[PDB]
């Protein structure tokens, strides 16, 4: 099915997780850059990364085109979209062509440039026939607008996701405003990415829905939040903090984390679910088992955990089967292992 | 070269990471019995990691032989063909001996296993996961009945094994039953696990014997790890993400088991491919030479050095990364746990 | 030199610490009620912390009255006489507001204690620890009309009082209604007090309105207070102790509090002696002179030069304890807690 | 009733508090030197702190006398043990007249000048009569023994604590070996004092008494511990720990952190219970009212506290009035309050 019947037919689309991060840290990403090169350099690791949240539950497997418009390479847009579709092939997903901000945008570059650079990476997903449009990372909604109304051409479905929090894009706009402006504008999904933790994450997504409400209009909602607490970033999202990007590890969310995440998220009403930076595999698989009961299966990971933390019945050492409860693990106050070390940083 | 000649020639050799672990992240393996039944199900997820270890720097691709005993020696083999890597059949501490049961039963377990790395040819082998020195003893004792150079570490920290066993007796009696290559894996971080190798060292030491030192610790943090390790830990094995090493702690590491004399340097559960990569880069001068995968790195974040945030720049250094005491980012939590 | 006389010269006053957390800590108050019964009950008890407040370099001694409404003002009276301090005859909120209870029945309660310090003329009145601009504003109107200087301060923080009156309109109606000194005491830290009390100057600004500005803020670290203040945290009020701020988190306050324009600066709840001592000396090259009680310290640690060890000597000066970022010694203990 | 007397009528001796960083906090003492002149200058100081304890349940008041002996004045010794004994005359208390290392040992200045300086004191205490002698603060066993072969001359009780953890005195002493050789001196109460908290004291005087058991000797158990959690110290105590003295507010142990020291002291035989360094009046109460079903009654401080949590049933807020259970405060894991903080530190 597509991704609005999808939605549609009340189904849970599962996204797909943090591929430049993931990347790098397996070796063929470079962090600082963050581009996509390692489709046509390593076809094979790129490939492998799909499948393992294929198999998690992912239901769309997102071109790997982050950073990956000109003035930042066609042939990698294509070779990224072929395996994508290559992969998606492979289960229940769809491929979705991905844009994020632009480095024009920022440089002052009037309007009418932007939208040819959009439109110049449209063209690849078109003659690759992906089943929807992403406008992603975006903090400014102005130009996330923009991306929108040249996606839309496409006849398409096109999701927008704001990289920003409850405080507002970039110049000042509430992100109940920006679900609006971007609805009145063409996608039909409409969420937040990355910049910070699930918890704050929801909470923008809430502001969006109650803008939206308020605005008469509707919209399915999204979120594919940064698998990384962030209880201390200020409006400008993680990477302000003194740890990005080599510097996060202690943050990363536990598959507990993400499961009462996956639950808020649909209690919110959000039928995308999705992850962004710091997002595993296991990570995804975290999203299907939690709502399981509500989609109706297991993914093909869960063959791996399946029993919700009872799978330490076939340990070796008393102890560890002691904690195959699923309560025990959704209690447990985890220990950073770090005690000389703070629990929070102030934002540079 | 082999792993006797390269060691002997006082190279640095790089270890590859955590099977299990990474692949249990993956969606392969399965927390608890920690089997490695991917190696047939999944080739191609267990070649990617090895191709990811080796492109990171390691030396040796481990046979993904944890516990059990197929396909997986094959997949080893043929990625380090594809670069200047060796495979090793290793053996672990046997469910035979966590239920007792005498010699005999034991070294017919590890027998089964070293008659397959014996047909598949491996370079070299490992004793691996052993709680007890006596266990491990019985190991080397059949592996070295092969002729291919053995090695043998110990999942115990400085207060000895399961049994009482100090760490320099530990390492005596390992090298005693022909061990060429001894120290530590898993259990504990690489500081606890230093601590340990250096009294190995010293017990070695003190009875004239020689033997290559080897280092394969946790990728996490476990300061409060008593002596049967983090499976004790509460947070074992599903909140255990806070503690993971940054790739500098992991630097830290290298530098510290390179000055303690440690040439077999590796890592274990929690061990990444970029963690392998820290090991690699940071003796990149001894050894010479950059793995390939540092052509997606910069030197203590150099490849910062050309994002848009000013504060990001300033990133791009040594003097930053090597100081920055990380947060948590997780204030309701503690700090440290205690076992069980 | 009266209170406003001191303050219109520009002088920089120093408040008295907290009583009632004090005294319970000695054996004298009661956590729940906290009761002021001790005036007559241990009047030494009383007059000693008074005297080391007085000491600490303290210009005011505040009548124990916070709650109730006796030989107090006599104490306070006689410990002010013993250096250049000044008597403030205090009202806090009413249970009876608590309760509701009508604006009769309130300033009934007030003017009951307004007669007391009437009758031991104080120097000045102190409207203190109210969550409500309007029971605020009742007790100032009622204070003022005594002839005697009235200081007003709220128990709220940036978010305004517990109506959703904003700081800044809050200090506007304090002013109105004939305060001339106001600001903000008890609930939260030092640093989020500062944020209430610029607010607070901001909305008085904006409004063409002059006042000296106040603050005397809890001794006790509260970043993960919400807008009811630290009664709200799970650990108030027994297990508070970890949150105490050092003598220099004190200095930093009183150096940032002087910046933004505050001249009447105290403390509240947690605010022992050296606390109050702290302000004195960080603030002692503006005020031209020492308390007495900086003939048994240091400056920043000055009065460890001579100790036996290295290192402890190493810690006699500012350069270290500025930065020094100190170990709760509880790892096993989160940082952070969430009100209720 | 006497010291040993009262022991030996299975009655629970309470110590007195830490007078020096009391003191030091109350704008009376000088940290570094550390010395006891107040007891002239500002003898109301001392007093009101005296009765503070003896109001919390002390049955002992100390002479104000630490860091009072000579190179380093009679008339201070004199007027402390005045202060103490006329506050000890105001309820059930005894004067202990106390010694501690001294620097003419440090400096290596042989056997025969030391005692001089302990008998230079001692002479004092006897001209005073005080009930008993306590040679605290001794991190040397040789001194510690030297200091009890002076003070038994007088006849009296005579207490010993060393300011030792579990791994031995400075000279590699164990400490149960220190708790034999203390006993084979005069000693007849044994112990530790300040260095380290509560928990880890505990260990050492269980090593205390083991070593006594296996000598066959037998003595009164005695701890007066930090007030400070330290688990972060070497053997050399909290002094090398980067926040001492001035950074170790954080560290304060709460009323239920002493209540559950005094407990396990009592479980582990101890009878002589104080309290050092960091200790105040409110902590000493907390071993009174921990100890109330075992010694049976409570001190006159509980007449403001009394109610075990239960007094904040007169609170005029909901919320904490539902901390009027003990249970509550003693199973609660209180924040530290400063999350950009360590939660250790490395001795240095
Ligand atoms: N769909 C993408 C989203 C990447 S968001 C990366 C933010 C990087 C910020 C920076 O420029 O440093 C992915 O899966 O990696
Ligand atoms: N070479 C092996 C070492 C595995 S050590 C795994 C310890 C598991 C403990 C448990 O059974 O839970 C690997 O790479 O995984
Ligand atoms: N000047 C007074 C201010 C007291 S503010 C006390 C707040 C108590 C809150 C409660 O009722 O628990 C003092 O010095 O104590
Ligand atoms: N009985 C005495 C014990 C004091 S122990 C003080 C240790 C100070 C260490 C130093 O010299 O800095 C007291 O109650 O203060
Ligand atoms: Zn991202
Ligand atoms: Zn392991
Ligand atoms: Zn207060
Ligand atoms: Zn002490």
């Known amino acids: 099915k597509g991704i609005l019947e999808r939605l549609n037919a009340g189904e849970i689309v599962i996204g797909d997780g943090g591929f430049v991060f993931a990347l ?46 000109e003035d930042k390479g066609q042939e990698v847009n294509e070779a990224a979209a072929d395996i994508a579709r290559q992969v998606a092939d492979e289960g229940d997903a769809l491929v979705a062509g991905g844009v994020s901000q632009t480095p024009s945008y920022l440089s002052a570059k009037s309007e009418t440039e ?61 992100p109940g405003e920006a679900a609006v402006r971007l609805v009145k504008a063409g996608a039909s999904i409409i969420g937040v990415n990355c910049h910070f933790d699930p918890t704050i994450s929801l909470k923008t997504v809430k502001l969006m829905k109650e803008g939206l409400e308020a605005a008469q209009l509707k919209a399915h909602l999204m979120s594919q939040p940064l698998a990384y607490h962030t209880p201390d970033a200020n409006k400008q999202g993680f990477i302000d903090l003194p740890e990005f990007p080599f510097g996060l590890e202690p943050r990363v969310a536990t598959r507990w984390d993400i499961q009462k995440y996956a639950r808020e998220a649909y209690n919110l009403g959000v039928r995308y679910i999705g992850g962004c930076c710091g997002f595993e595999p296991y990570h995804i698989r975290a999203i299907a088992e939690e709502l399981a009961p509500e989609r109706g299966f297991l993914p093909p990971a869960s063959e791996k955990h399946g029993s919700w933390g009872s799978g330490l019945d076939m340990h070796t050492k008393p102890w560890v089967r002691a904690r195959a409860r699923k309560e025990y693990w959704e209690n447990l106050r985890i220990a950073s292992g770090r005690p000389y070390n703070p629990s929070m940083s102030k934002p540079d």
């Open 114 to 174: 932007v939208k040819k650079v959009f439109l110049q990476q449209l063209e690849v997903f078109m003659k690759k026939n992906v089943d929807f449009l992403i406008a992603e990372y975006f903090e400014h909604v102005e130009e996330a607008v923009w991306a929108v109304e040249t996606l839309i051409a496409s006849g398409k479905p096109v999701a927008a996701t704001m990289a920003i929090g409850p405080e507002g894009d970039l110049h000042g706009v509430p």
């Open 24 to 69: 790098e840290k397996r070796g063929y990403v470079k962090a600082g850059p963050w581009t996509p090169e390692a489709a046509v350099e390593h076809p094979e690791a790129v490939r492998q990364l799909h499948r393992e949240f294929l198999r998690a539950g992912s239901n769309v497997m997102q071109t790997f085109t982050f950073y990956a418009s």
